[PDB]
Amino acid sequence: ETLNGGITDMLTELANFEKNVSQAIHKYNAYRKAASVIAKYPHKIKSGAEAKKLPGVGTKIAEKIDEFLATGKLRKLEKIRQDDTSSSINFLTRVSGIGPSAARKFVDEGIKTLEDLRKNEDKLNHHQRIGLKYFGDFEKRIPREEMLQMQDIVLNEVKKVDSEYIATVCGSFRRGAESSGDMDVLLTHPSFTSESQKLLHQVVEQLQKVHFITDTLSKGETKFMGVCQLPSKDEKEYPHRRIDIRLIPKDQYYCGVLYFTGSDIFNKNMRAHALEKGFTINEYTIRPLGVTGVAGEPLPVDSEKDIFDYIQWKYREPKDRSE
DNA sequence: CCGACGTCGCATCAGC
DNA sequence: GCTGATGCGAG
DNA sequence: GTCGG
Ligand SMILES: [Mg+2]
Ligand code: NA
Ligand code: NA
């Protein structure tokens, strides 16, 4: 932090404005990359030129850093921050299911605040209402102790519906993280393959029957997004939580797990490495690239380890897949 | 100079 | 009613 | 906005 935190906040703020106000998702990711890279740099950045050396920090961000160091502020940001229209739009997107477009329409027609949304239930789609209901809870983090508690429930109820199911809670949770943002469960069964009833439904149903799943954002044959909660002790109720459960075919499961285990940077590397070794990994399958680039049949995979074999890597533990 | 920067499931909107 | 686009939130 | 063909 305090080393170059002034700078990473500036860049993260600018990132958020590009995403929500300007609708420039690529400039959003540029500032985000620039932020991460400076955040890892263990020296108090002395000038914009110094920063430029780092990947993802270019001319225009070197300039902003120079201005910030010299003045301790950045004129464009100070100005956007006082902007009534924009700071509202930026804010409203914090409601889950409200993106840059819905937040634009809203601010356009007066609606700017949480109370403004609360007064206009009838202009919110279903996702948005749930988002408003749980705005506070959703911006909280999930402590790993609750994550374990949550998992206990998920693994118990999945098994109770049919013992042949496999459920794996992935995400940063799986990489040993102290806290999580939501839960992502990857679910498969022997009767579901690429060449292959209600398998997702029955599990949601049962998580609902024991009152773990409280609300549904969206649900189809393969992906469920919704809300969940741990039950009460006399002690204060637990916050409501985002949970995603996805149903993957068995032959694509361990690719699924690898992929949704991450981290984003770790997959970015593992794809680059598997490349030269003559393989293409995606979230679904690993395939061999033939002489000119033509990817052939997907190789069978029966554990995460199989993938690591194909590309001559030693199976790295989820605990060490930070990059 | 100029295009990639993942792509996808699902809910909901637009067009027909 | 149907089909395709667009919005959203996820690596 | 940054990078790179
Ligand atoms: Mg049985
Ligand atoms: Na640079
Ligand atoms: Na949102």
**What HEC string does A40-78 produce?**
CCCCCCCCHHHHHCCCCCCHHHHHHHHHHHHHCCCHHHH
Query: Is A309 assigned a ligand-binding role in the annotation?
Result: no
CA count, 13 A, side-chain hemisphere, A148? 6
**Structure-token pair, residue A5:** 């935190």
Strands A241-247 and A183-188: parallel
**Structure-token pair, residue A60:** 């225009």
Dist CA A142 CA A112 (whole Å): 28
Can you say whether the dihedral through the CA atoms of A161, A165, A170, A176 is positive or negative? positive
Question: Method used for this model?
Answer: X-ray
Is A26 (CB) below 7 Å from strand B? Answer: yes
Nearest residue to A95 via CA among A117, A80, A110: A117
Any idea which residues of A carry the catalytic annotation? 64
Note the resolution in Å, 1 decimal. Answer: 2.7
Gap from CA of A53 to ligand 2 centroid (Å): 5
Provide the CA A70 to C1' C7 distance, Å, integer. 41
Environment class of residue A214 by beta-carbon count within 10 Å: exposed (0-12), middle (13-18) or buried (19+)? middle
Nearest residue to A28 via CA among A16, A36, A44, A40: A16
Q: What residue ranges define each of the domains in chain A, with the CATH number in brackets?
A: 4-83 (1.10.150.110), 84-140 (1.10.150.20), 141-259 (3.30.460.10), 260-322 (3.30.210.10)
Helix, strand counts (H, E) of chain A: 16, 9
Residues 6+ apart with CB under 8 A from A155: A167, A169
